[PDB]
Amino acid sequence: FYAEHLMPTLQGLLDPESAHRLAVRFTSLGLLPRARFQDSDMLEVRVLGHKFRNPVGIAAGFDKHGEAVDGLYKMGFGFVEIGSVTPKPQEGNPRPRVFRLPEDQAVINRYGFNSHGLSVVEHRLRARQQKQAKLTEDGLPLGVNLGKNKTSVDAAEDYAEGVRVLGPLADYLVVNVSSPNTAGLRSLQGKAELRRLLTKVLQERDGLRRVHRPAVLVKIAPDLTSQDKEDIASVVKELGIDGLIVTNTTVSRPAGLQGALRSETGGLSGKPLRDLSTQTIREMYALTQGRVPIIGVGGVSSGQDALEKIRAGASLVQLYTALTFWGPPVVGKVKRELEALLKEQGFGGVTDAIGADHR
Ligand SMILES: Cc1cc2nc3c(=O)[nH]c(=O)nc-3n(C[C@H](O)[C@H](O)[C@H](O)COP(=O)(O)O)c2cc1C
Ligand SMILES: CCC(=O)Nc1ccc(N(C)Cc2cccnc2)cc1C(=O)O
Ligand SMILES: CCCCCCCCCCC[N+](C)(C)[O-]
Numbered sequence: 001f002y003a004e005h006l007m008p009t010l011q012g013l014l015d016p017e018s019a020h021r022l023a024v025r026f027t028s029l030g031l032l033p034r035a036r037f038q039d040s041d042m043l044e045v046r047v048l049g050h051k052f053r054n055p056v057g058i059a060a061g062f063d064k065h066g067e068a069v070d071g072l073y074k075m076g077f078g079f080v081e082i083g084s085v086t087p088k089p090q091e092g093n094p095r096p097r098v099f100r101l102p103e104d105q106a107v108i109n110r111y112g113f114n115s116h117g118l119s120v121v122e123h124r125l126r127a128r129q130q131k132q133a134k135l136t137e138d139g140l141p142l143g144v145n146l147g148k149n150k151t152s153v154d155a156a157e158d159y160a161e162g163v164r165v166l167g168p169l170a171d172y173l174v175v176n177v178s179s180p181n182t183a184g185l186r187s188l189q190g191k192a193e194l195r196r197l198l199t200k201v202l203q204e205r206d207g208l209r210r211v212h213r214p215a216v217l218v219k220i221a222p223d224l225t226s227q228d229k230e231d232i233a234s235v236v237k238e239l240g241i242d243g244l245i246v247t248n249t250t251v252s253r254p255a256g257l258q259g260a261l262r263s264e265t266g267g268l269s270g271k272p273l274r275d276l277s278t279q280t281i282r283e284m285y286a287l288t289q290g291r292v293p294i295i296g297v298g299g300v301s302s303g304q305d306a307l308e309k310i311r312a313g314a315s316l317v318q319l320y321t322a323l324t325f326w327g328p329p330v331v332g333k334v335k336r337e338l339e340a341l342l343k344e345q346g347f348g349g350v351t352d353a354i355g356a357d358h359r
């Protein structure tokens with residue numbers, strides 16, 4: 001009903017940003033039905049120092065300001081990541097800044113880190129901090145994704161601020177150095193810049209009290225050169241980074257895009273990104289010898305999509321764009337299909353399938 005009627009009818013009435021705002025509101029108010037699908041033990045994953053009751057999370061960008069976390073767990077996500085959050089509030093780019101490519105099952109966005117800022121999000125998370133502590137213990141962890149202000153003159157200091165303010169409230173933190181929509185940000189993926197940045201981030205993280213000490217992951221682009229990926233793997237292993245998120249949106253425009261809006265500036269997400277992301281997961285898993293947990297993201301809209309990223313080396317996956325086309329039912333669909341495929345392919349559970357292609 002969502003895929004065939006409601007979503008198509010909604011998208012025909014609201015521009016994508018308005019639709020997004022409404023979706024966040026509806027979710028935060030808990031207007032959706034509580035998901036029927038009950039997670040089986042097969043879907044449980046233990047990684048990053050936590051239990052995840054299922055491996056399917058909501059990717060950063062949907063709940064940028066931490067407004068809909070509980071509604072998202074109700075939707076059936078096994079973990080929630082909010083953000084990106086910047087130190088000071090900022091408006092992001094002028095509108096329009098989000099575009100649907102329905103013929104491609106893709107989206108292009110250039111939000112530019114519109115963010116309520118650390119202080120607002122801090123108090124928002126504090127208001128439900130003990131509820132989250134129980135959810136986490138129950139296998140439903142919370143990630144917080146950190147960004148940088150447009151006018152900041154010290155990128156490392158922006159991330160350090162984010163570690164200090166939201167680190168205590170997060171099960172894991174994400175150093176997002178892969179947004180295509182903030183000038184100069186992706187250059188922080190370079191070896192020397194990344195090592196300096198992550199050394200500072202990890203020191204700030206290590207200075208937090210033990211029970212408030214998050215895992216730290218780095219989120220990378222799908223558009224890296226082979227040299228870029230080798231350098232990132234090297235730095236991650238040198239510094240003991242806890243994990244990678246692979247990938248952000250692509251600035252590439254793959255041959256074959258049909259959408260009228262295909263040449264809008266911004267990051268491309270959804271199906272055209274899927275296999276580019278999967279191959280990046282595959283490479284980073286190999287470069288890190290399977291020792292570094294990967295959250296695989298990009299174009300996941302089915303159980304097969306999820307399992308392909310898991311077999312390529314992901315311990316967990318996330319989705320966003322699929323939600324915008326298929327709506328809330330896609331979460332249970334992905335989980336149900338993933339369980340069936342795991343059984344069909346001889347895996348006792350998700351854990352057995354992680355990196356299976358490499359063996
Ligand atoms: C509208 C939109 C906003 C996004 N905002 C962020 C963000 O703030 N921080 C971040 O790390 N990734 C952000 N992303 C990237 C997603 O987290 C994800 O990496 C990417 O969309 C690929 O997954 P998908 O194809 O399932 O959407 C955004 C994506 C979209 C579509
Ligand atoms: C790319 C910008 C973006 O986020 N877009 C959307 C996000 C959610 C939804 N829903 C209506 C799904 C939904 C419905 C109710 C609750 N949660 C999610 C639709 C869209 C859309 O663009 O049509
Ligand atoms: C309020 C301080 C400046 C940033 C405002 C951000 C508004 C965010 C609106 C909901 C999220 N969305 C991506 C749909 O705009």
Ligand SMILES: O=C1C[C@@H](C(=O)O)NC(=O)N1
Binds near residue numbers: 113178248
């Ligand atoms: O990390 C990010 C940032 C986001 C934005 O434009 O705010 N757009 C994206 O596609 N990825």
